[PDB]
Amino acid sequence: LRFGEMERDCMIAHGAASFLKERLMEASDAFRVHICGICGLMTVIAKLNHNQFECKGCDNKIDIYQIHIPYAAKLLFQELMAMNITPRLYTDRSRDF
Amino acid sequence: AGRAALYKEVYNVIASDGSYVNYRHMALLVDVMTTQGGLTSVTRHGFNRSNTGALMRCSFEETVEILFEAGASAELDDCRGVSENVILGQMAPIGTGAFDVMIDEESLVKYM
Amino acid sequence: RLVKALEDIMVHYDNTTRNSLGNVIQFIYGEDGMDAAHIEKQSLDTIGGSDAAFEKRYRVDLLNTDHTLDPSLLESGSEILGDLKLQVLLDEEYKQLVKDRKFLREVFVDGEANWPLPVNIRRIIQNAQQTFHIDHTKPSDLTIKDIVLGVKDLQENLLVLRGKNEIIQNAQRDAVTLFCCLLRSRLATRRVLQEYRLTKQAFDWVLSNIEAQFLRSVVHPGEMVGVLAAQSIGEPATQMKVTSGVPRLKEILNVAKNMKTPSLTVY
Amino acid sequence: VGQQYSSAPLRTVKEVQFGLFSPEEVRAISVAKIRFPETMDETQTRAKIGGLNDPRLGSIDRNLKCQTCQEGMNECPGHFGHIDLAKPVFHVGFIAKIKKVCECVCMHCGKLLLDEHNELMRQALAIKDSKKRFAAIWTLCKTKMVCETDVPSEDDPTQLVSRGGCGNTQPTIRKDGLKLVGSWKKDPELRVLSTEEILNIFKHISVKDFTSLGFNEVFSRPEWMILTCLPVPPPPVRPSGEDDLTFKLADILKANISLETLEHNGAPHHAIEEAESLLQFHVATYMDNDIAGQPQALQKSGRPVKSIRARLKGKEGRIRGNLMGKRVDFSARTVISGDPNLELDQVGVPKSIAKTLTYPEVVTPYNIDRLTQLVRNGPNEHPGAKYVIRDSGDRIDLRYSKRAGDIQLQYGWKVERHIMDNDPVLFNRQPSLHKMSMMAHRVKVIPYSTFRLNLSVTSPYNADFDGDEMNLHVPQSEETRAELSQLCAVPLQIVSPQSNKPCMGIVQDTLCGIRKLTLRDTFIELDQVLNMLYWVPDWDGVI
Amino acid sequence: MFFIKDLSLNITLHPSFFGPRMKQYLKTKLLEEVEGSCTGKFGYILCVLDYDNIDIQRGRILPTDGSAEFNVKYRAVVFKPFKGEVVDGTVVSCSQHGFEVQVGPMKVFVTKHLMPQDLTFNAGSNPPSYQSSEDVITIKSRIRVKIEGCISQVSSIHAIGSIKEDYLGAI
Amino acid sequence: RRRLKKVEEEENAATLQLGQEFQLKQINHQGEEEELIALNLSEARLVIKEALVERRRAFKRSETREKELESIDVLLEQTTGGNNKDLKNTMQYLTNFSRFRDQETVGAVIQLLKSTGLHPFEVAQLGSLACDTADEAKTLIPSLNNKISDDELERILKELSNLETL
Amino acid sequence: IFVYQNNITPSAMKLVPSIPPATIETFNEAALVVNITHHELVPKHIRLSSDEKRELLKRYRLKESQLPRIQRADPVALYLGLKRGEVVKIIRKSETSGRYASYRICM
Amino acid sequence: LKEKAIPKDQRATTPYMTKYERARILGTRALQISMNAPVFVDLEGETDPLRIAMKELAEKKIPLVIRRYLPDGSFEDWSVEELIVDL
DNA sequence: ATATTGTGCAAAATGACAAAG
RNA sequence: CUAAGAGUAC
DNA sequence: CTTTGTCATTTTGCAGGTACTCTTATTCAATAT
């Protein structure tokens, strides 16, 4: 069943954030992807069985993080990259609120 | 005075058919519309032009143009809006997400 | 469009209303800090009526006979007459009521007396009357000083903003001014001793219930009031000489340079 | 089974930093240089090396692991390649921006036209937000048509101070399709501004100049608005009958090879120019096929090609169609019926739906017995269980499992079992114009094929029983369950914030009935009084 | 050289472990992961100072998971070699390509290119050694060496030392 | 800042470029800035022993080279558990090349080097290396060039050599 | 304050900003015939001192941009002679609570 | 963190637990109980983790603290024990 | 004999253009 | 499988 | 001589939410290996 935009709006108005996250991630599509702390791109080669992570270009192997994002979000970021845009994802703040 | 007149017009529209809406909702609407010093329309030309985060702005209208402008201008999205966390699939900072639940080890020991 | 415009508006832990950027939309939610679900329509008694009717309803004089009080109303009803300090208390209370009358007549120019306010005082008074078995004939156990000081303490206890500086205190007073006007209009000395005939324990119970209900009527931080307002405005629109209804709503939200019926009102 | 364990630290995204790809960054992140327009080799059974489906970009076959990461199609995100373009081309999305930028900067010396010496320039540069800075700078410098090698002094307009200006005359720039034509003032000389010269002039813009213009030194420089290395999205982005993106990439490679051969072998300038324009057109339509004026790049079947911008915009784009709202699991939908014998917060659930939708309950000493009983009951009878998930992530399907014998549950395991009575469930009717049109109900399993709900709760849902359908969502965790029961429950919604009054009431038959019951004429005899008293569940038992 | 620095580590605790001995579990799990460890960013990590009160802070329940993410801050004694720094050590092994000197927890490989020409390898000696006109370098022999090249790997720091400069060699 | 990529001058002790996180000032866990302190071999050994004996006391409530080596081995076994190979090698190296015995001498050394107002890295190197003459110290430590007068360095090395015991 | 009859020549407008701290303000008589601030729609505007602005920002934890804005061409702002960065406190008759105090920063 | 944390002596937020706070506390505690966390209360036969969490909240035996974030990034720590549950 | 290639708002932005100094 | 179109329910 | 405000054009982006069923169609034809 489609969980449309205004259903999301009703859940927001109810204030149930965890249920909204559960609907949009565990109930539809949860994808674990790897990024590096230097460039926020998903261009990390991850060999999980060998336990080896490496971002070519940045030339790093310990500044890696894993994030759970919707697979549609990963596809969107890859389509942005293919269209010459860098949606760098960072796991810490660089500015104050 | 513009904000007061705007509230009066919205209230007249709502009460034309005899319906009643609490004051605070229309007050919030007109306050948002006039918070920038002028009349900010509820349109792609209005509220969507405020520097409030590219990801949430693109979810409304002119999506790809917004992404292109954000890339060219190297905008930083701090992921405070609801749409940003919806897109990233993490608990938005709203309702039950407007705080952090932590652990009081001292209290935990104190209980036994 | 409305939902998208207002989606990020939230009430924060300092009771301000802010968007995703932290910009302040309202320094206190709804200009009173109250949850809409806890608001009920009630009448402001001071604003209405005539000056003579207002005096008869509220004025209490311990030194004359035109606006005296029946000694049977309260236990010490024959000793308070001729006193000075209690007359001072009544004088300041009546002066405050007159000031509230003027203030409300300034706020509501048309004189409308029924407005939505958080705590329903009438229901509390009825509950106390039916709970403590007020017989309406026995002299009241209350003392005038008890009434006045209890009302003042209750006003001090209606906290919306918890800060500890001049700005926050002034904002708190501005937040509770109208509800305090209502409270003084209802829990006046004359009304308490004559119309309602509360007792000491009943009066204390009324004060505690008013305080608890007012504290329970405060909006909760984290409430997504923007989405709520957008939906509360948009849902009636679906049910829907001068343009009105949905076309006029469109003319308003889309701030249109040219509108179909530009009319001007001259007094 | 999900995704196997990863040792990388788990964090949440805090900031999204936008920008543009530098060509050297494109080359650094790429894992393969795409050169051949074909996808499969001559054998038609494998992917051609160096082609558009290079196994280093990710495996197009479920049976083969990715050649780069050695992970299945379940794990491999896909890895970008890169096409090294023969000549620079404009990015279709930035063309106007590029025009504005080149209209703000000298086309010969690559310096901003009006330095701080100019009067309005201090006001323009004092602006804080980058967009308004750029707008002011552009509306100030667009009408300046000379580099002004020498300007009157800021102190007074008597002496002349020479800036680093070449003194040439800037042209008036227009766009004719995918290219920019500049007309220099006749001493007009009209000529197409080559993308190479514009790229060169952008590379000569000083750091201060383009950071005043609103660009970033590290994340987006103006010369990165010119394409010289196209990133190649992996097969995940264009899965296969090839995708439209694959065909457009093949066309881009064909045009690139044609231009490169025409340059290598020499040719008249006309042929080189035509090949360049073809490459520009292909690259542009690969990103935005809805360019005003130009004709849409049709597909082999004669239909317009689906560009990436088409994949992102619209109600069915990625954002609105897949991110702001998406199809979900553990949901049901069916026709609704009224039931005066159901509580206000109860919802009647068909037995088949209750047997389909499931909840994962963690095995605990407090629920070992009943969970074991449900597992014994199996998935074909209600109440029962449908799956058993072990602590290792392995999933046991209760169908085909009774052959292996009774399962001995252990604490920490999960039993994915049929939804039973009093399970909180979100109940929704569309269009769902307000929060009351989506409320939490308690499950009551009933033996018919319709959702059943109290008559009083139909008003907030705006629901009838003339064929209306409603949707049901099952929370899958204790947190979501709890906040559904404690925030969205029907009783908590009785008084609406919309107009500070209750939104549910007595309606329809009961309303009529109550008016008939409370008339002064109405009197009831002893037997009917006893019946009516017993019909009240909480009646204290005194007549 | 030996320093002490302010380090932090993010540990995650399962719901099962939240008992009165939670502080003990956090402190022990900081150990067995940082004690005796090696990182390229800060060198070797040998021990943790100030064990009596290590700043564990509050912890943070991860939503949808229930595990708590503590950010334990502590003081750790580290040994970070640096380029061009003289330090003492002991030889433990020798070979054709060079010889290894034990400095603290690390082994520094001085290559055969980075000794005076008079010093030459000798495999005839048991154990094999490096012999010159005036001195011989054997197993368990004190020697001072200057580090001139460091490659910073994470689980194994590698450094290059030399004795070509004046007053470098056996003590 | 969040600069993608990074350009850095190569680390070089002689240039005193110890690293962006090895600067002179470090923000402590309390939020204030403190000088980047460096431990000489004897001082580091004493600090390690103090920490380990404190840990042993906490667990309980909850000189000559051979005897010292045996005692540190027994205490190391009692206090911590496994993965102490690096720690053991460091501890035995410290006991072998320890320039001082007890707290008083290392305190005197650190205050004497403090009196110089010199860089912590340089004073730690001076206290660690058992140098003899002055030009020898300068060639051992290029960072000391054009920082301290020759006579002062030679004399302080003389008192340090005097403070050497066993 | 310069009060003119019909208009100002634009060549006179450019020299209106003189050497600071002196400021020149132009008003048209036709725009001054009616005092706009007596309209019941116009609430009470009170300019804040720098100390008051600092206290406000401190107490509400705000930045300059996080306050509601008032344009430096608004008729009330021109009436009070507001300048950029100055904050006006607005006192309003509210129908939920008797009095409501807002603040607007001149931009 | 030191600058972000507002000292306990001058917290200016409401002392009453909000509805969202109560919902999330009950959800988190129920989830932890469901994952075999220790229970700090006596059980009268209740088996649902959610109602176990409710019983724990009724007598203030939940060892959690809310970190209420202010719009500027500062925060106040309120123990569940001291928050008043009136709603 | 078969693969390969020849729509209607309505706001915003922009351009043309008679008056003004 | 994909795409387009048509009809339809509230 | 250049502004300057001003109209008349050009863009140009959008157009409720869910849900069901069925039908057709996937470049035609000429050329060369």
Ligand SMILES: [Mg+2]
């Ligand atoms: Mg119907």
Ligand SMILES: [Zn+2]
């Ligand atoms: Zn990287």
Ligand SMILES: [Zn+2]
């Ligand atoms: Zn791969």
Ligand SMILES: [Zn+2]
């Ligand atoms: Zn130039």
